Structures are given as structure tokens and as C-alpha cells.
Amino acid sequence: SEAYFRVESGALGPEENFLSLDDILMSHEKLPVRTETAMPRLGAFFNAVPQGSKLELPLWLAKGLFDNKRRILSVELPKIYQEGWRTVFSADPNVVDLHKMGPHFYGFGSQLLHFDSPENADISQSLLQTFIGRFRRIMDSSQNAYNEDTSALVARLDEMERGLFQTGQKGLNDFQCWEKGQASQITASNLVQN
Amino acid sequence: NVLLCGDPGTAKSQFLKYIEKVSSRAIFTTGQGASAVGLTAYVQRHPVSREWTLEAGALVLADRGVCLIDEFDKMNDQDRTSIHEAMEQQSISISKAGIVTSLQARCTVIAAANPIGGRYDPSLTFSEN
Amino acid sequence: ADEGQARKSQLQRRFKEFLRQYRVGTDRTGFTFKYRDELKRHYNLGEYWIEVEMEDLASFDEDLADYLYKQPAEHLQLLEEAAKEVADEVTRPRPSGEEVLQDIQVMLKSDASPSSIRSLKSDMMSHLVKIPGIIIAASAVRAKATRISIQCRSCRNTLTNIAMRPGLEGYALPRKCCPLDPYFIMPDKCKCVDFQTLKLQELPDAVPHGEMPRHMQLYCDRYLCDKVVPGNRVTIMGIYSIKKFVGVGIRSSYIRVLGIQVDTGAVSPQEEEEFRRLAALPNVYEVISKSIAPSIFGGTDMKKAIACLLFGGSRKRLPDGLTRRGDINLLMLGDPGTAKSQLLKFVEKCSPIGVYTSGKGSSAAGLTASVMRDPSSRNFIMEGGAMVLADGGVVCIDEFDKMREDDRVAIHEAMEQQTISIAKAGITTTLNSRCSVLAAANSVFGRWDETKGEDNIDFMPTILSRFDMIFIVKDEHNEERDVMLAKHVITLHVSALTQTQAVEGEIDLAKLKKFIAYCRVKCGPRLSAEAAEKLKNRYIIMRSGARQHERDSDRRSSIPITVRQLEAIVRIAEALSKMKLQPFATEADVEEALRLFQVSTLDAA
Amino acid sequence: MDAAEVEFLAEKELVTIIPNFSLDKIYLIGGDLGPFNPGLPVEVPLWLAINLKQRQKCRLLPPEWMDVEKLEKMRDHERKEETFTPMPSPYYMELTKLLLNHASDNIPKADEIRTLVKDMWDTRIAKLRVSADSFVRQQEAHAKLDNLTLMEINTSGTFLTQALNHMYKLRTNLQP
Amino acid sequence: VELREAQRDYLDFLDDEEDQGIYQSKVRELISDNQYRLIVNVNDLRRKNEKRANRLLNNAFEELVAFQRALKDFVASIDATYAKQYEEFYVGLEGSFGSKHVSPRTLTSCFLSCVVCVEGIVTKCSLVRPKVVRSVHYCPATKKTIERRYSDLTTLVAFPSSSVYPTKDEENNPLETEYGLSVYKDHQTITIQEMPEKAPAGQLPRSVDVILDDDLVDKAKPGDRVQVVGTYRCLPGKKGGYTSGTFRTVLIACNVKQMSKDIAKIKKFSKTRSKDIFDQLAKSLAPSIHGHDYVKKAILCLLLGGVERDLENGSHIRGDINILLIGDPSVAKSQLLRYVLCTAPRAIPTTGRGSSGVGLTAAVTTDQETGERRLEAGAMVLADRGVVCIDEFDKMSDMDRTAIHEVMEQGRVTIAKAGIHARLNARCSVLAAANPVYGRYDQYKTPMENIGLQDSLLSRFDLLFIMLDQMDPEQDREISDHVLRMHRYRAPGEQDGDAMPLGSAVDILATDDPNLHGTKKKKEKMVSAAFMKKYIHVAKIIKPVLTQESATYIAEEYSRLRSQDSMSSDTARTSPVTARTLETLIRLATAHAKARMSKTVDLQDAEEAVELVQYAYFKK
Amino acid sequence: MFCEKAMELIRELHRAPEGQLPAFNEDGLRQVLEEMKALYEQNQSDVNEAKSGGRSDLIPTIKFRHCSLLRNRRCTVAYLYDRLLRIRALRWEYGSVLPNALRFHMAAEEMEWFNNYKRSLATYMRSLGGDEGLDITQDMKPPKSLYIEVRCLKDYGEFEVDDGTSVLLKKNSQHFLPRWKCEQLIRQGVLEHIL
Ligand SMILES: Nc1ncnc2c1ncn2[C@@H]1O[C@H](COP(=O)(O)OP(=O)(O)NP(=O)(O)O)[C@@H](O)[C@H]1O
Ligand SMILES: Nc1ncnc2c1ncn2[C@@H]1O[C@H](COP(=O)(O)OP(=O)(O)NP(=O)(O)O)[C@@H](O)[C@H]1O
Ligand SMILES: Nc1ncnc2c1ncn2[C@@H]1O[C@H](COP(=O)(O)OP(=O)(O)NP(=O)(O)O)[C@@H](O)[C@H]1O
Ligand SMILES: [Mg+2]
Ligand SMILES: [Mg+2]
Ligand SMILES: [Mg+2]
Ligand SMILES: [Zn+2]
């Protein structure tokens, strides 16, 4: 029915959604870079920022400054997307804590491909295989954790996987309410709290 | 709880002995003969196991009887202050040698004492002597 | 015998049909197959256990419930096998890597009134028993074989998948294949489960007068391992039985546990909604303060301090690895007969983890930790004192002034650093003591004597600095307060018969306990920037006042004012915010923290 | 789509009732019904059947497939097969819930019928779980689910479709 | 019968000559180094054969004997004679093991027969003893030699052989043992304990027994934080004709890594780029603690240390620096100790009331592998070539400080207990913290009465600092600002309203995956903690030497300090200046030279060292 | 970094997934607009300096401030639009006249948008048929019964059932009425559907 629905996240696509709060928060996360030419007047922030300076700045700003000729700055991957952590994911995707390793792991990784790194293919394959490995546990936990504390199950999941978990939980709760007949009652909305 | 204060030769100890005889589960102790640890509870190496074990003191052995403390003024302070928890909260809480537990001490304490200098002087209040 | 196998198969089929057919609900609303769905969801989650209620089994088939009560050792095996096959037909087909079926542990519980340890006479042997108690010791998890394979040592023939009896009883190896003892047990080709022995002390309410508390050995199996820790209060459902490896025909007894019920952390969503509503309503602080020790007239600021202690601040690990304690330490010096001991006895009951100790009844080793020789192994082992037993909770040290100085010295590391560093008997470790110390004490001269001033306190400055808040709760005589207090006391004594009814504008003790646990695990606040600025300025003014008072007296004050007091105000404000589940402490939260600390600082003027 | 809406579609299925009232043919927009003669069977949509049973105006008759022998055969066939088997009705779970919750008195051996329908439901949801896992593991582009019912698809399909959208975008993010 | 397929898989994996040559190169390195276990990365095994990697981690014993036989075949193909020179070639596994990364607490019974990587702290070790694997015997009556292999439940094949040797009858003739032709392997048992901070709430740390064989026996001592990769197994404790189901469990280790022990060119460039890098390091020492600059410099000197001299006459001059902090409540003494415990390699915590003279030095304990009693090292012996932090030092018993006296004075401790009479090495720097008598420092009493310790003990400390809770308003302003800033801080990898989680295991690879200034602030370019750890680890080794100018200035200023004591106030002098103070001056100058990585103690080092001594001796 | 004040608007809305409407962050909106004004003034000064003086090194920082400005715009527009989504859900979940405790959270322009949306929605609903349109806001759940039993939660005024017939909605009184007449009051919480 006509319930409130957030603007959906478009982080996994070629470009993120403009009005998505999730995409905005995802792109806020910082990204290491190396500056290719000195920038005047910005020494107050990191008077000129000298050439060759290492910086960590937001992903939206890195994408804004980044032109494919690599004229202003060079963009480097975060550690969690480099080969060692990709190997960690290859070991067993179920045990890594993607909530602590950036809450928007898949969205940040997908937008990290925009900079045309030589290991873009490796990053993409790592993201795909991580999702494939974690899918079954997400599915079973979401669809079988009925009416209990879901904190331990949902703790290690990134925000995309948390959305999938809530979708599965919503389906489970809907079917259980149907089977026990509670779905037939007409009830006041959540706004009765006011 | 009762406290019998007064001068010598007034049958206070005799009253305590009578209460010992009439009442079941009664015990009697005196002054320096008592100790803090013996009054409340004591931790010992068990004789055959040699592991630490908690054991009942006076106020735990009289857990639903009367503990009689004669010549109460003449105890040591460390011995005398040990009965505070037993006298009001009616438990004896022990945290020793790995034992952390509280025993029941639902005991009525009846005590006898002399004032300062032995003889009670009516010129002073009870708290003053 | 075929007749015996027929009996076992029939009983297994009856248990199977119980698990297949049992329902709860009504036709007016709907039905859910309780144990079918529990089996399916637990197996899909990888839990491989269920919890069959004896009352439900009795309602479905009373004969099965009676058989399981009288002869649980025989029939629980059949019930577990029935649950295994029901899980198979309920869950299959299963994806790749889940083809092999797993064994199911059928725990069970009951609504019946429990028995007691001293009620366990000889006639209760091999029956189901339900007793309460307190766990005082807990073994490390060890592996017990459920099925073994034995290979002949000489000719290398093998006997495989020999079923081991459950519990602490063992199995006799055959003496025929070769030597008199032909066999060894193959360490690879055997299947083992976790097991854990516990010691269950009799409840202090249940000890008869003058007796020491008895204790009973427990055997926990598979998923019952680590379901309970020392200090917890439980109801244990199990099988009273002999161990089966002074006097001759004697056998030691123990309870094979098959159901654990914590009598009082996984909250239900309904309880979480209640806790969120409690955090959301505007007067939750006053509601909590009224809920703390409702039988105690007055002392509202001290109750508020106890609320801040119960909820506690937020632990913080800084970039250099140094950790700041979130726990709040609260001392209550003052006059006798002023409900200090009763407030401690309430906090012990109310805190999610709570340990009550008498200062005079304590020792340095018993408070922090003890090193003792293990009798069965000759090694020196560690034993948790009160501050380790209360880790993640509150220590209530009553009559705190009666401790010897060397024993009060022992808790200095645990009060501030929240660790107990030990170097004794060749074992060297750093235990955790993340706990709050709530202390009660009387004045040096019994009552607080205002003419003598700082001489009323014998505690050192070093230990006084470690207390976040220090109350000098003086008993001030006043006829109006005395009349109202006496009326309250007499009505309280009259109210010992009126069904223990609840009160408006108050949280039940159990609900308050669970709410404290929820807020503790969930919310860690911080200070807002302007609030921190306010606290900074007020700290400078306070320190200047303390310095000038000390200069005017030409004597150092007993109670100091230090950076610990600043951080104490910080964590008090964080506790106030954590009551409301707010990520930040506002200027009003810092104002209430300053007000409470000002009450505790007028008490140091 | 909600389970109540799947029940709403399931309520269109035709069932037979024995009225205890007299009423001539009524011309409904979805199709005329009746005449309703006392004591004689008449076929009506399930919503009207449940409404009349609630109002004590008829006795419901079970469908031909609500039979313990037939349901046991269907259950054993479902457990024996790997693919979803053809079900007796396209809304069998909802039919079972409505008819047994409202007319257990009329329908004999309703406990056995309910338990067998639950067995079939558990088996087929397990098959759907296996199908979803195989889909994601093998990175299939499409699946074939011929004999699934609408309630079975609705129970797990929102999660599965969202997960497959995420998987598709993850495996296609190297398009240039 | 089926393991030839697994052996073929492992031999195919090892023969890396076709594609990358990694593991043929590693086997070649093994041959050249004369070693007999190959270190294999299961990540590479995953990349080449995921199926075999999963089988290896879940079916460990059969897969490992297959892998070892494949390794023996491969090393025979590379070098046959070297393959004959060893009984069998082992394989130790490193890399990422997925869910098998466990602690001693989480290592439950479901992990049996699996490869598991256990992280923890070593509590004890048994003595190394040989273990027979194959004994060779000779028959003089027959001029013939025979052999017998031996196995027990610990071995991978796990059959229990008879313990005794063939003795008086083979061919009904007497045999005798050829010990030289027989082969024995080293055997050791250690106990790995859970990390104490990671236990849940009131639970004490749990532990698991570990068995080391052959070349692994040296690689762990008590106090080490290690990661042990091995196979988890139960040992049936049969009585003979009967057993209880209760079996003890052990971890047969195949690899051990020291996870806390452990490029220099960038350090040697940074010491040139930075100006007086000692000051920057000292300021960046404990960022959370404001002020106490000279104390931080002294702690950095303690961390770096002097150089221990051996004289031609055989006497030695102790190189460690000992620091005693005395001060009021709440002046960060305990926090400075905690920072040193976190930053330094092999820093042992200790507190005055919670320790004993026995536990500080050594205790007689029964080794349950045999029943014989041996010395188990105490705190200061564990701290050898390290630091020991003693909080509440004024609360120790005198009999307990008798132990500390020898350790500080001579760098040893003498023990005479059980069957052993020995001088144990206890060469450690002591960083002690104490409160003055009466809790708070009294300005109206002499320092020797505020300080309750005996003058004999105080002579053993290089530097003694008195630090006071002086309630100056400006100092209070800056301190409170820093404290509230620290309490306001939250980590970037944490949500805006999180309470920090209680400890749980979070290490999921045998080697660290993410492989110099702080970025937030402008003032003075604070150094990061990791770089400081690495720099101190490098700079401790430099070993600089005195110069004529620095020696002359140290001697002149020491003479000034001594002559200044003639008219200095006896009522307020912190400690009497003596030759011990001169030793302190030399050690501090050497430590400053180590900080600069200079290789020559210069006049700058002498100036800073004697400034520090002047402050410590004649300033509050 | 510049953007953090804009991120507080975003974090405010993201911290309430349930769809309830927080108070309008007027001060935060003023601050981010002031920041954009300052950024634009600096950018204009720098860009005209660079172009007039022929100085080329300014162009990276020009792009820096330009991207920062576009970021500020994206954040505030997303904030306003998500607030519009939350407001739009109120017409369907509760009804037309919002309670004053919630109406106090809305901006005046938000009430303007909401009134325009209500007028547009009512116009669309009227235009669906020849006379009286179709009230698609009703029939939110599938219908089960023609009549329902309802219980009055709020002490409330007279409620017309049909013309001269009406029912007094006094608290705890219980009526049996048509579902389509009672649906709006149940959704508003005046009535409780039972059974
Ligand atoms: N009123 C009395 N009637 C009978 N005997 C009495 C009375 N007063 C004292 N006595 C006797 O006095 C003797 C001493 O009694 P005792 O109980 O020891 O006195 P007390 O109060 O304890 N004096 P003291 O021990 O010095 O404090 C006993 O033989 C009593 O019987
Ligand atoms: N304000 C109060 N309201 C209710 N009961 C009170 C109050 N003050 C004292 N009491 C009662 O007085 C008795 C003694 O209380 P208690 O808890 O021992 O206070 P206390 O100050 O700790 N005593 P002490 O150990 O000598 O300092 C108990 O029965 C209390 O309930
Ligand atoms: N200069 C400071 N900067 C930051 N925090 C400080 C400072 N001085 C004290 N503190 C804080 O004060 C608290 C107590 O520190 P602590 O190290 O125990 O003091 P201490 O000198 O050891 N006093 P004590 O343990 O009573 O002898 C800690 O939380 C410190 O972080
Ligand atoms: Mg007498
Ligand atoms: Mg008390
Ligand atoms: Mg300290
Ligand atoms: Zn045999």
C-alpha cells in the first residue's frame, strides 16, 4: 500500500542515485589519493597543498576531481579492496565483518571501479564472489530467525545485506501473521504514537 | 536484640546463662574468648580434601536461635564490629579464598556489658558512659 | 529381541507423531505447528536443538509424558531419534554441503513446581527432577565420545560405531577379539560432543536454619555447554543418577542436565519495543529514580546517583590503545540506620550482574582473585574474587570502613584500571574487572560529627579519588520528616500482606533489570561539543574553589577534586544519556551531572 | 503483494455448499450463481461459501482432493520427486486454511488433512530454498518453476528477486 | 586405498615449475637450508585447487599424510639423497583458514580432525625430550640388523605401538639396540591460553594443550603471543577393558608464528628529515596524556636504553634504565605504565598488592607430562631484555622487594629450590609507580618522608620523578580541554551511537593484511603509534659510542652537580648525587644517541641527558 | 572538511528508517546555504583572478570548490525530497488533517506542498467516474466481511451512519457497523476493530 519508501540505493549501478540518502552516506566515506599537481589556497584543509601530497578525502570529491587523464590526483584503493583482503574474502566470506569494514561495502566497492584501476576486474570478481558466499547464510538467517533477537545475526552484515535481511524478515513475519490470522484485522497506523 | 548494661553483681551474666538454658539452638560466648572470624564464619583447608571450605561461626550456628555475648564491652573492636551485618541484615557475607557467598544469620543477639570504670554513674547519659 | 525392538519402535513412532501433529491456537484465529516449525527454523539456522515442553507432551499423550518422567534415560533417546527423523522429513531436500543429517538435541522444560537438593532422597534416583540453585563453579568444555571405533592391536581388526551411553558413565571394552585386552580406541574414527560439569549450590532461601549450603554436581551436554556461568541463578531439569566411575556400597550422585532455565540476554522484539518506549517517554529519569528502592522513603538524589551507577557510562578505547572506564564508583558515608545497606541490597538484586560483599567479611584475595593449588593436578590455578565474579556488573561492599587497609589497597587497580594484575606462583595474567563499586560506610565517630570536620573520614585520598560520587548522608532530625517517614514505615510493614501489587509511575524490578541490560549493551553516548565546553569551564571554577578552601583551612581536604572527578562527571552525563538511548549528552544532561556532583561536593566542603 | 492479497485471489476458487435456505439465481458480475435450494449441493466462490458458513446458512463440503488417501499419495509423490509436482489446487494452502478453520465440523479427518498439507508445504518450501541457493551459486540467468503456487512464490520471492537484482548488478558492473 | 588421488593432487600442486615456480623454489630453498618442513600457504592451494583446500582443512590427518608423502616424492625427484637424509618431510600450513581461526575458548569439540589456527598467550612449556620413531637393532649371534617403526596416538597415522624394544629374542637370539642408527625426534608440550582481555565478562581465560615435534620445539616460550596452526584431536584415556567417554584433547601443531615480534632505510631518512626527532617522539609518546614532557622523555630513554658494557676485567655495567614515578592521585602514573605495556616489546604488568617475591622471580611447579618439578619463570625473568611495570609499588611487602633489589642491582636473580641452584637472567628495565606516604604529597614534609621507600632501594633507580596535582587554573584549563577532547573522540570505523563491543576473536589470517604523522592536527606533526613502535624497535639496536667532547661535558657537569650538593638544601634534595648519578647520565646520553640513530654520543645527547637529570634531581 | 554540516541533515533523516517525520532543521539548512554562499564568493573571486591575471594554478581549487558546492546542493535537495516522501505517506497512512504535534514539525512551505498535493489527489479521485469519483484512499486491505464490530478508544462526538441515523462514540461503547464507514476512523485510531 501507500507506505513511505526511501529512494532506492543505486550504488551498484554505473552511477549512484542522486537523491539516495544511502548513496550520499556511502560516498561520504574517505578514499586515499596522491595529488598530481599543487593546489593553492587549500592548505587550511589539506597556503598551497604541494605536489605529490598523500591525502584521504571523500569519494564524491575524488570522483569530482578525477579526470581519466589523471591530471589533478591519482586514486588508490582502500586496504579492504586490495589483494590481501580479497584473499581473506576468498577464504570464507561468512566470517568477515562488513559492518566494521565500511558499512556500504558493496556500494563503495562498485563505485571504486569508476577510477579505472588496473585491478578493476579483480575487485568486481571479489565483490561478486563475496556476495555469492554470504547469500546462503543471509537467506537462512533472515527467513528462519522468527520472533527473536536478530542482533547477532545482523551484526556482521553490510547495509545492502541488512536490507536483504529485513526483506526476508518482513516476508517471514507477513506469512506467520497470515497463518495465525492476525493479518485480517484493520488497525491504526504507526502514527497513533502521536 | 537486647543489651544489658550495668554495674557488677546484678545478675546480667546470670540472665544470659538462663536464656542459654531455656532456649533451643542457643550459644554462649564471652569477650576476648570470641573472635570476629569465629563469631561470623571461618574459611579453612578442608581436613581430607585440602581445598578451601567455608564453615559456620557463632551467628550462623544460631541462625534461628539466640547468640549470647557476655561482657560485651570488653571485646576487641575488630571482633565487635563483625556482627553488624548479622545484627541488622541477618546475613553473613564472606569474600575469601575464592568463596563469595552469603550465609543466613537470622539470630537474636542478647548481650551484657559494664559501663566505663565498671560502676554506672547516674550523672551521665547512657551514651556518655 | 523382536518384541523389545517393537516396543522401542512404537514409542519412537508415538514421539514422532507428537512432533508431527502438535499444534497451538484456536480455529477462531489460526494454528501453528509449534515443534515442526521450531525444528525447521532451528535446523535451517544450524542450531540442531529443540525445547519440548513436558506439559505439551502430556496434553498430546499423557502416557508418553509419564514414561519420560519415570524413565527419562530410556525414552529421551527415542525422543531424540524421533526429532532427528522429523527434522529430516521437514527440512529435505537440502542444498549442497547439507546432505548429511545432523543429530538433534531435545532439551525439555516444565511448568511444574520445582523440588530441592535436600528433597532429593534415594527414591528419586533415575527419575526426572527439577531443582533450583546457584552455579558456583563451571568446568572448561571437554570432549566426550558418543560413538567410538576400537581396533585390535595385534591383528588390526576393527569394531566400529559402538554406541556410548550418555552421561558420566563409561563403556566396557571387550576382552575377546590375541591379548587379554586386544583393543585400542581409534582417536580419529570417533564422534565426540562438548560436555561441561557444574556445581549447583542450594538456594540461600532453601538452606534450613543452621545448615551449610549443599551443592550438587551437574553434567551439561552439547548445546547446554556455556549456557550458564558462575554466579547465575538457574532451575535445572535433569536425571538424578549415579556417577558409575567412607564405606563399601556407596556411589556418588549427579544430575544429568537436559534443560537449563535462567531464573534471573536475548530480548524479544516486544520487550525491545517496551524498552524503546521507556527510553522515549520524557520523564524516564524520574521514573527510574522512583523505581529504585521504592520502599525507601526519601534519598532521591542518592537514588538518582544509583541510577547513574546502574546504567553506567561508556567505555572508550583511544587511538594509542589506552582505555577509559565507563563504570561509576559511588561511596555512601554517613550516619547509621539510614537505609544504606538496604540500598546496597536493592542494587545487588537489581543489577544485571550483582555481587554483595561485607567489607569485614572480605579479604584481598577473595575480593580480587585467589591463587590456589588444584588438588587433583598439583598445578596452581586462578579463582575469581568478588570483583571478577561481578565483571560487567556491580560490587556492593557493605560496611566498607571495617576492611583492613591492606585489603582496601587491593582494589585500587580494579576500581580505576578495571584489571587485576597477578604475579604469583609462576602464573602471571591480567584479569578483567570491568565493574562498578558501590560502597557504604559509617563515620569514624559513628555519627558524622560536624565539629571534628575532616577527622570523620579515615579513608585515604587515593581511594577517595577513585569514587566518582561520595555522599555524606547525614541523618538530620526534623519532626515533619520523622512523622511522614514513620507513617511510610508503618504502612510498609502493613503492606507485607497485600499481594505485592505494582505502583503507578514505576518500573517493576525485573523490567528495570532487563532495561538496564538492554541500554548497557546497546547505547554508548558521547558529550556534545558545547556541553564539553560548559563542563570544562565549570571544572576550572570547581578546582579553584577547592584550592582556595584548602588554602583557607591550611590543611588538605580529605576528599580530593581531580581529573578523575572531571571524568566522573563525564561518565555520569553519559549514563543519564544512556537511560534515554541518546547518542549524545546534551547541556541538560551535563547540568544534571553537575547537580549530582555538586550534591556530592557539598558533601566534601 | 501481501499474503492477504494471495488469500483474496484464493477466495475466488469454487467450492460446493449445501444451503439451508431458499434463493433463486443471483446474477453476480463475475458470473451468475445458484439457484440455492435447501439441502442440495451448489457450487459457489469460496468467499461466499465462508461468509454463508459464518452466518450459519450452509454446510461446506470438502473438495474432492481433501481426502486422506489422495493427500498421502500426493505427499509421497512430492517427497519422492525433486521438481515441484502438480498440486491438486493452485491455492491449496489458502483453501486448507480457510476451509478447515471455518468448517472443521463439516470436513471429516481435518487433522490428517491439515498435517498432510503442512507436509507438502514444508517439502515444497525446502525445494524452493534449494532452487534459490542453486540459482545464486551457479549464477543462473533464469529458472523454471512450473508447478509452484502463488502463495509459495509470494512467501520467499521478494527476498529472492531483490538478491538476484543485486547479483545481476554486481556481475554486470564492468560493462564498458 | 583412496589417498593416492589426494597425493597426486598435492604433488601436482607442489610441481610449480610449469607456471610460477613458487613452491618448487620453496622446496629448493628447503634443500639448500637443510630444513625438513615446507611452509605452504593454503591461499595458494585455494587459488590452484579449492576442492583440495577444503578437504585439507576439513579432513586434516589423511590429507596431511597425503601432502607429506607428495612432498617426500617431490623432494626425492629434486634431490634423492637428501630425501633419504630425513625420515619424513613435514608440511606446515599458513594463510587464511576461514572459520577455523579460533581461540582456546571457541575451540569446541566440533573442530576435531580439522586444521585450526589458534591465537593465544603461552603460559607454560614442558622440557624437550626425545621420542623414538624408528629403532634399529643388531643380532651378534646372526650378524643381521632389523628395524621397528613406532607410533602413538599423537602421530598422524595414530596406531599405538608397543613401547618396549625387541630385547632378548629375535630368531630366539639376543638383540641389542643401535642407538646411533636409530632415529629420535624432539617432543614438547605447551599450553596456549586465551588472551585475557577477550574473555566474556567474569569468565577466566581458558586454555588448550599443544604438542610440538621436531623443529617446532624452540619456537615458543611462556609469555609469547603466538598463532599455532595444527590439527585438533582427542586422546582416549582407557583404563584397560573400560573407559569413560571423557577424552582429553590436544592440538598437534604443524606451524607456529610469533605474532607480536615482527624498511630501515626510511627510518634512517626520517632521522635526517626531522629536527631533534627525540623531542617529536617524546611528545608523540602517549597522545592521550597531556603534559609531563620530561617524564615522557625519561620513559623514551627507558624504552631505548643504554648499552650494557662488558669490561676487560670481566665485570659488567648494567645498561637498563630504571624510572620511579611518585605522585598524587589522578596524575596519570598508571596510564603511563599502561602505555608502556602497550608500546614496548615484552613488557610485563605487575601491581604491588597483587604480586609476591616468588611470582616475581620463579616458582617450583610439577610438570604434569612427567611429574618432575622444575622452575617456572616469574615476572622479571619473563621480562628479560624488556620492561616490567610495577603499579602501587609503595604497597609491596619488604620481603617482596628483596627480590626486586637483586634484579635491579645485578640484572639477575639467584634461586636455590627443588634440585636447581641457578642465576636466572632478569635483565629488565623497571618502571615503577607509587603514591607518597599519606596518599597525597605533603609540601610541609621533606621528600625523604613523603617517599616511604628506603634510601637503599631508591639508589637503584636511575631517575625519580615527583609529580603533583598542582591546581593551577591555566594548567587545569589545558588538561581539562585535552581530557574532554579525548572523551569526545570516536573511532572512524564505529557508528555514531555505538557502545564498544566486549572482546571477541577478530584475526582471520596468519599474517597481517594491510601491508608517518597523524593527520588530524597541525601543531608539531605528531608521530603515529605504529611508526613509533617500529622506530623504537629499530633504534634499540644501534649501539652508539662515547666521544671526547660529550665525555668531557658530562664529566664537567657531573662535577658541577656534585659541588652544587655542597650548598644544596639537605631538607629538599630529591636524591644524593653520586657515581650512580654519573652512570645514569651516561645511560641517558646513550639513549638519546640511540633516539637520533647517531652512532656517536654527541654534545647534544650530553646536554639533553644532563638537562633531564637536572630536572629530575632539582625540580618538582 | 566543508561538507559535515550537510551530512548532519542526511544523518538526521537516515537515523529514522521508520518513516516518521523529524522537526524541520531550519538552522542546519541556513548554515549549509551560508556555507554555499561563502564558497561561491570565494570561487568567483578566485576564478576571475585566474582568468584576468592569466594565472593557471587556481584551476584545481576552482574545481574543488565547484564540486563542494554541488555536494552541498545534492545533500540539501535529497534532505528536502526525502522529507517530502515522508510527508506524502501521511495522507495515506493517517488522513488529510494531520495532528498538531506532527504539524508543528513541518515547514510552512511543506504545508503548502501538502495542501497542493491533497487538492491534486482529490481532483484526480473525483475525475475517475461520472459522479462522486472513486475514493481510492479507502479499501487499503482486501475485504473480509461486510460488517465489523468496532470499539471506541477515544471519547468522541456524534458520528453519522446514514442521514438521521447516527451513533455516539463514547469511550468503551461498542458498535456493529459497515466496514467502509469505519475504515477511516480505525486507521485514525478513533475505533478499534475487534475479532
Ligand atoms: N536480683 C538478684 N537476684 C538473685 N541473685 C542475684 C541478683 N543480683 C545478683 N545476683 C547474684 O549475683 C551473682 C553474680 O551474677 P552475675 O550475672 O555474674 O552478675 P553480673 O551482672 O554479670 N556482674 P558483672 O559480671 O561484674 O557485670 C549471681 O550469683 C547472681 O545470682
Ligand atoms: N528512609 C528510609 N526508608 C525506609 N526504611 C528505612 C529508611 N532509613 C532506614 N530504614 C530502615 O532502617 C533499617 C536499617 O537500614 P540500613 O539499610 O541498615 O541503613 P544503614 O545506614 O545502612 N545502617 P548502618 O549499616 O548502621 O549504616 C532497615 O530496616 C531500613 O529499611
Ligand atoms: N595529564 C593528564 N592527561 C590526561 N588524562 C589525565 C591526566 N592526568 C590524569 N588523567 C586521567 O586521570 C585518570 C587516573 O589516572 P591514573 O594513571 O590512575 O593517575 P595516577 O597518577 O596513577 N593516580 P593513582 O593511580 O591514584 O596513583 C585517568 O583516566 C587519566 O587519563
Ligand atoms: Mg557479668
Ligand atoms: Mg550497613
Ligand atoms: Mg593510577
Ligand atoms: Zn585380534
Residue numbers in the entry:
A (entry chain F): 2 to 47, 58 to 205
B (entry chain 2): 518 to 646
C (entry chain 5): 21 to 197, 207 to 274, 285 to 303, 312 to 652
D (entry chain E): 1 to 176
E (entry chain 3): 10 to 271, 281 to 533, 552 to 656
F (entry chain D): 1 to 195
Give the text the authors published on this PDB structure.
The human replisome is an elaborate arrangement of molecular machines responsible for accurate chromosome replication. At its heart is the CDC45‐MCM‐GINS (CMG) helicase, which, in addition to unwinding the parental DNA duplex, arranges many proteins including the leading‐strand polymerase Pol ε, together with TIMELESS‐TIPIN, CLASPIN and AND‐1 that have key and varied roles in maintaining smooth replisome progression. CMG translocates in a N‐tier first orientation (Georgescu et al, 2017; Douglas et al, 2018), with the leading‐strand template pulled 3′–5′ through a central pore in the MCM ring.
We have determined a 3.2 Å cryo‐EM structure of a human replisome comprising CMG, Pol ε, TIMELESS‐TIPIN, CLASPIN and AND‐1 bound to replication fork DNA. However, despite our MCM3 construct lacking these amino acids, we observed almost identical density in this region that we attribute to MCM3 residues 524‐533. TIMELESS‐TIPIN sits at the leading edge of the replisome in advance of MCM2, 6, 4 and 7 where it cradles the parental DNA duplex prior to strand separation. TIMELESS and TIPIN form a positively charged, concave groove that grips a complete turn of dsDNA ahead of the fork junction. Here, an invariant phenylalanine (MCM7 F285) stacks against the final base pair in a manner characteristic of separation pins in diverse helicases (Velankar et al, 1999; Gao et al, 2019). Although we observe only a single unpaired lagging‐strand nucleotide after strand separation, it is positioned at the mouth of a positively charged channel formed between the MCM3 and MCM5 ZnFs, strongly indicating that the unwound lagging‐strand template exits the secondary ZnF ring through this channel.
